[PDB]
Design a protein around this ligand. Structure first.
Ligand SMILES: CCOP(=O)(O)OC[C@H]1O[C@@H](n2cnc3c(N)ncnc32)[C@H](O)[C@@H]1O
Ligand SMILES: CCOP(=O)(O)OC[C@H]1O[C@@H](n2cnc3c(N)ncnc32)[C@H](O)[C@@H]1O
Ligand SMILES: CCOP(=O)(O)OC[C@H]1O[C@@H](n2cnc3c(N)ncnc32)[C@H](O)[C@@H]1O
Lengths: 595, 666, 664
């Protein structure tokens, strides 16, 4: 039940030879350079080789967990849009930056680096005309159309701080995130299209903004052109604003530690935290993980099927793939629209070389039956990635058997919003995989197991407890927006000297890491990171509810105040979908007399 | 023999080619030319500046010519189609550092500006030190008003030397200056102030020009009644005469500057950060935007090479800083090169028509640059005003703004140059940033009325407007286009990029469209013969304005003319001529009717029967812009009976002349 | 046959020259001096720093001493006449990076600040790491208030260590700090807050100094009723006693910094961006820029105090004074050494306090004002004689002439005759020390600043002719020939006042406003303010010479002399004299003491200098900087107490009422 790198990962059959290979010892030889007291050399070289800098840095790293003053390359300056767009445009303008796989397959097209750069510059000029300055927050409420990348990168280009809100969030959820970050500008769309259905985004925006007193300008992408309300003065059409502007905009020269984005994320306690990532270390971590975990080569076509509203979309749709100058997929549809062949129809149409998805999507397709995958080529694929949650053994094999035809590496990538980039994963040209194991830590990641009853490291193999990291890494989140106390309390205080992931883990006799799962009240349902406390708070607000308990699929047990039962389950399911979002409805709601 | 003909000239073609004269051969102690001595030396250098291997030359010139804070990596990118032209994008620099600080550090007492005041006795030299100190003071004042990098600042200043300090103070802090000709109407000023959305305006109490007062502050007050965004007005006390001053909003330049230090740091600007907006006038005011490095490099290189400027030169561009010619060849080009530049406050005829030449001999100017309208005006006034001057300090005489008739070219050559100067006919536009086609004076043998050959970085073609296709070879005529971007091309029209693309990039896709008709003759010389909109199509013969206007001025007594087309049942269009005669010409001994017949006969001889004017109107003057362009569109619309659709003419050189034309046409 | 005489001393001139002692010779385990061992070694180096070939030295020192983000091209430009002085203009840097980040990266646990709290038990060491984290948190707070590069921020903080974090947080983001002595009146604070047009003010709930509370927040509340531009106040919870807090406007420093990360990027500042405004007494906002000022404070700290990497530098002044700007915060921290922040007074809880501090922390240099030295001398030797103090190598004096009698007390009891004494002359407007001994090189004379610092070329001008007096044995007014890197660049929004005060009196020169003499050995003697000169029967008298003569009498603690108009001699000397506490006014009646004091002046200087009238007073009116306010005394003697102005913020306003009573 151990899977050595298959021929597609040995440079055989004309494929690109792996960056790291061919065995475990070859991974350790490199990894040892990236951790410990003599690792600055490797990190300084990779930083200078991977990114284009305006000013060089002097100091590789400083700071630490205790006070949350982590620093990487502090004196250097750079721009994330320059590194993701301009520098590749200058070398090969007509290269496809984005494969835009529209909700309807026949509406898909390739977007060149030139076209993406031009649209990013126009949007940036629009934002500057609204008075957006370096360090201002800008909220983004966009579905999976390719212009979402232009939106993110236009903010990065001028040094604004984008805060992307998942297009599956409700009006109240959008409003809360818009208000927390105090942005004065919101970028959205008239409607979204997903799985053949319409998302009334502008309608949701108008309801949210009724209680957002700081928002002054809304830029509206005309994705469908159907009639939506537009407030005079406040609301402008993306195409009409961009048509006034030049198709080039200079890049703001950003410090390595200037904030790049806020991304609101659920914790075990309290409301969603605005997780803040800075610029150089985050960009470096995503570029290096993309190159090494997926063994990306210059002509690859990388298909991350995630959503830009989540950290997986930030790191492995936009920043990672574009920093590397390759082609990245922006997938607007679902895995089963029009049919469950879609993922494989897509792979064959574009000859995708890697595919990155959640264990849930894989399990759903396995439910729909092997008819939809057994008769495709898929030989373009070399690596199949999984992220967001444990992948079951049956899913791992099905992924390897059908999607991979037993010639692909399966990289099980463990990480979190707060880690910025992948933390534990097999390198696919070197590591033999066990189904369900993340295997070995990535470069810069020194992880350990701690007994929670003790607070001390369990050294050796065949141990189990809580996962922690010994030392900062370049892409670690730097703060929680305007709430640093919560950052320290959650991640740095439980085990002083270490970073606390919040997951359980075990290291078997071979040193393979096995991610047990959250030891707190965070649950992963279909790859999404949901707090049981937020679901209870959503349910508690329903008129008549007296006490709720939500436990990890999500299941809620509710008791009503003394003032049909299946019809009540639906009204509470709608209450959760209204407070959080449709994706957050519990799998079952049980009405009991006492908890 | 040839399809393309030179502009009509009384001199035979075989006697009409002018080699670089001894002052431009390094003789008589003059500087050796940077490019010389012949056409082959021009081609050898120019070939380095165009085509797929020309990055090397442009990168070297960029690094040699300007002082940078950060080097660039990329030489050029982008293009016409979407209007994303980029040059040296990763570099950073500052225009004020390059025009002031670096020269002040080497020679603080060198004269930066010869300030020739309206009254000659008030003129004086302004050192680089003084100019830099005043620039820094104004920059500190602007910062105190909260002006930040990228904010627009309007400038409504007449031709006193502090106008350069106001431009360069904006550049020093990265504000975008938008300069409006002093004397423009309140309405024309308002439209430009509102369009650029500036919050600060810089002006004078009054200007003085030709012994007349320009009521700048009163005009400003009228304009700002309809400009709600302007919060601060800085008022230079040019005359000290009583003007209204609004409490809070308005402050005296001297009182504000006296509070500030005389040094200010330079903002580090990206190459592509906007340097200025410059409004030109057939629709709404068009705010032409130039960025920083490519514009500065183009003005510096053209000033050096087209005028063959050397370190001790005293360069006399006689234009106004409200015109692109003053932006590029008064302020940015000469000061970037560290030489001495003239700021001329007066007119070519105040106190007398000897003014230009009194000025040349007083200051020993080494080059003079003006417009054909000024040249035709001085020619009209007679030779006594020039013949008894020295003028030998001059080596190059330049002409800009419209075609120069060979008759006017010979006058310039004979009297201003005494047949010992090179004449550079410099063709370009606000949108090109710097000179596009011109003789290099140490290399090119000139033909009267020809711009001759494209400048470094300019690769131009002729398109047949009837087919949309490029005409190959020599002896072809059509419309002028450029094949590739050049460093100083305008980057956009302010907040109206669609107008930029539709005006310049859409008419001939793949090319830049100038809007001028042009010909490339059998020797490869370029002739720019008038605006495309001004062409007159008589029975299929397409006549350029320059050729017919050049024929008419061959007649004794003619001072200046303009020809326009009017619809005609038999010939499609017919030529109509507006003719100004010298003041002494006796219009009783030659009635209006016999003059017209002599003029028509002369046009037929040198051009052809089809070009003879159907009707001729004698007028005391022609409608012109402040810069000297003849407003043929106005004349064409009046002949068409559309005198009520003319537009905003409140700010032309003399709006009263429009009523005279309307009366003479009726 | 010398026309210039040393300040009156009881020691014969032949026994009054002090070579660098063993602790400044590299003996006794102490570091070798950077410049030594004699005068020749000083002048050899100094010659590289002035004149037409000095660019090379200055460019090298600038690049060696500071960390730059962008190198400069031009070393210097501009000048006095128009006030356009420039140094290193194209370079970019950040003062907080140079005072914190770069040392934190080298040794984060090295002590940056010895915080000597008002109560000794509360003193502690603050690491570079801790100081940098605090600074960054405050910078992030200021950024959240919309503070941009080039905005002014007022600071009204007492001598707690966080005042350094507040200064450097402003520098980190490129804001311009304006610090105001804690305890200045609401009116004085208001005038300075209004003049700099700041929108943010940083203060404490209260200050603690000498066992007394300073009601900083109460004063701030009164000032801000007349400061319409201030929108945010950040309040450091120093004492925890209840103080009013205005909703919206006022926020607690700890509560604000707890929201923010403990790192903030540095704004990349041009060399000539303003670093700070510092008001002196209309209030004059002296402006310093960034690179030249920082370089000047770093070089003077290193060379005048012979600072080495492990030194523990104890400047006992207040950050409200330029001395605290340059020699508590910027100079010592730019050099990466340890610096003292002293919250107390020299006599709390007892006058042993300085020496308790020196022995507790093993201070290697001590820097204070002559007023403090004479105060400790007044309290007698029991408080100092039985301390160790051997960790000290250099004792500095700044702010006014140091009388030779007090110099010797400093030398004998604080230094135990084993320290170099550096009498450092400079001004708020010079940024850093202008004339001082280099302690490993110069043999000192009591009361003499000795020789100009690197980059300072000073001359003496005869004020009657406007002409430079060349050579030695000359006296007149002190001027500087050429700009130096740390010169003030303007007076805030009043450049005309800057030019008229400093640059127009003697065109081509900088006018200090002090009288000076250069003796036969070339030693400079700063003898008092030009405005304080007294002219008796054609004899021009400086304050320092007459006050130095008076303090030679037993039991005198401190004096001040001023002129009184006289019909027959033009002016007459009037003197105000404070005596030691144990001096018996019953054994020596006041009338007899005053006669003795006048006889002593007549013998040492001459009859024209002998006071015509002597007033014994309990103390003298002094600024918070320690300056004796002779103008106030002069106006009272002249019957002009109505024109005194607002003195609500001098050290003790009650003393003016005593003086008025005695002169009446
Ligand atoms: C990347 C999205 O990050 P987030 O939305 O912040 O969720 C992060 C949380 O998902 C879980 N998780 C992610 N990858 C894996 C994996 N390979 N195996 C097991 N569990 C995983 C885990 O509990 C983590 O703590
Ligand atoms: C530089 C002033 O730029 P503008 O005020 O924008 O005018 C630009 C317009 O003037 C015309 N023009 C300028 N110079 C010449 C010339 N040497 N020969 C012929 N025509 C010329 C032409 O019609 C152009 O398109
Ligand atoms: C550094 C404090 O600067 P300020 O508070 O601006 O005082 C500056 C004014 O103090 C005086 N002064 C300072 N040090 C000395 C000294 N060592 N010897 C003599 N006089 C001195 C002098 O009158 C100067 O002009």
């Amino acid at each position: 039940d151990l899977f050595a790198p298959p021929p597609r990962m040995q440079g055989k059959e004309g494929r690109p030879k792996p960056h790291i290979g061919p065995n475990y010892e070859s991974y350790v030889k490199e990894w040892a350079k990236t951790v410990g007291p003599n690792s600055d050399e490797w990190w300084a070289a990779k930083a200078r080789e991977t990114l284009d800098w305006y000013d060089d840095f002097k100091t590789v790293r400083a700071g630490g967990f205790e006070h949350g003053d982590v620093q990487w390359f502090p004196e250097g300056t750079l721009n994330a849009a320059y590194n993701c767009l301009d520098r590749h445009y200058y070398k090969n303008p007509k290269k496809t930056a984005i494969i835009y796989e529209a909700d309807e397959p026949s509406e898909s097209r390739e977007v060149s680096y030139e076209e993406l750069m031009q649209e990013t510059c126009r949007v940036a000029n629009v934002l500057k005309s609204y008075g957006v300055k370096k360090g201002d927050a800008v909220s983004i409420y966009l579905p999976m159309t390719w212009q979402a990348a232009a939106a993110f990168l236009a903010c990065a280009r001028i040094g604004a701080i984008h805060s992307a809100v998942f297009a599956g969030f409700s009006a109240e959820s959008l409003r809360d995130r818009v208000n927390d970050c105090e942005c004065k500008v919101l970028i959205t769309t008239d409607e979204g299209r997903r799985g053949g259905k319409t998302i009334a985004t502008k309608q949701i925006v108008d309801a949210a903004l009724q209680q957002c007193p700081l928002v002054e300008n809304v830029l509206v992408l005309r994705r469908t052109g159907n009639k939506v309300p537009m407030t005079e003065g406040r609301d402008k059409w993306w195409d009409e604003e961009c048509a006034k502007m030049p198709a080039y905009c200079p890049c703001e020269r950003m410090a390595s530690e200037d904030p790049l984005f806020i991304l609101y994320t659920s914790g075990s306690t309290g409301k969603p935290k605005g997780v803040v990532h800075s610029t150089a270390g985050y960009l470096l971590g995503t570029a290096l993980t993309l190159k090494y975990v997926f063994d990306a080569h210059p002509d690859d076509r990388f298909a991350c099927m995630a959503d830009i509203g989540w950290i997986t979309g930030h790191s492995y749709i936009i920043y990672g793939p574009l920093a590397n100058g390759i082609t990245t997929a922006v997938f607007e549809s679902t895995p089963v629209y029009p049919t469950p062949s879609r993922y494989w129809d897509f792979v064959d149409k574009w000859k995708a070389t890697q595919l990155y998805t959640a264990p849930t999507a894989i399990r759903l397709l396995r439910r729909m039956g092997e008819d939809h995958v057994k008769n495709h080529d898929l030989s373009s694929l070399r690596v199949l990635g999984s992220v967001g949650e444990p992948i079951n053994p049956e899913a791992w094999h099905w992924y390897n058997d059908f999607a991979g035809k037993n010639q692909c590496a399966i990289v099980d990538t463990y990480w979190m919003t707060e880690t910025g980039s992948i933390s534990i994963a097999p390198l696919p040209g070197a590591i033999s995989t066990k189904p369900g194991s993340a295997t070995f830590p990535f470069f810069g990641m020194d992880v350990d197991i701690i007994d929670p009853q003790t607070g001390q490291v369990l050294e050796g193999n065949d141990v189990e407890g809580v996962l922690v990291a010994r030392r900062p890494w370049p892409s670690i989140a730097r703060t929680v927006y305007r709430d640093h106390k919560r950052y320290l309390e959650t991640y740095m205080k439980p085990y002083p000297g270490y970073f606390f992931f919040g997951d359980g883990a075990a290291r078997d006799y071979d040193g393979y890491m096995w991610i047990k799962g959250r030891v707190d009240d965070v649950i992963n349902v279909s790859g999404h990171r949901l707090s049981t406390a937020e679901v209870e708070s959503a349910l508690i607000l329903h008129k008549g509810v007296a006490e709720t308990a939500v436990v990890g699929a999500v299941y809620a047990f509710v008791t009503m105040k003394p003032e049909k039962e299946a019809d009540l389950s639906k009204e509470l399911a709608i209450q959760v979908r209204k407070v959080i979002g449709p994706f957050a409805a519990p799998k079952k709601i049980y009405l009991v007399s006492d908890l």
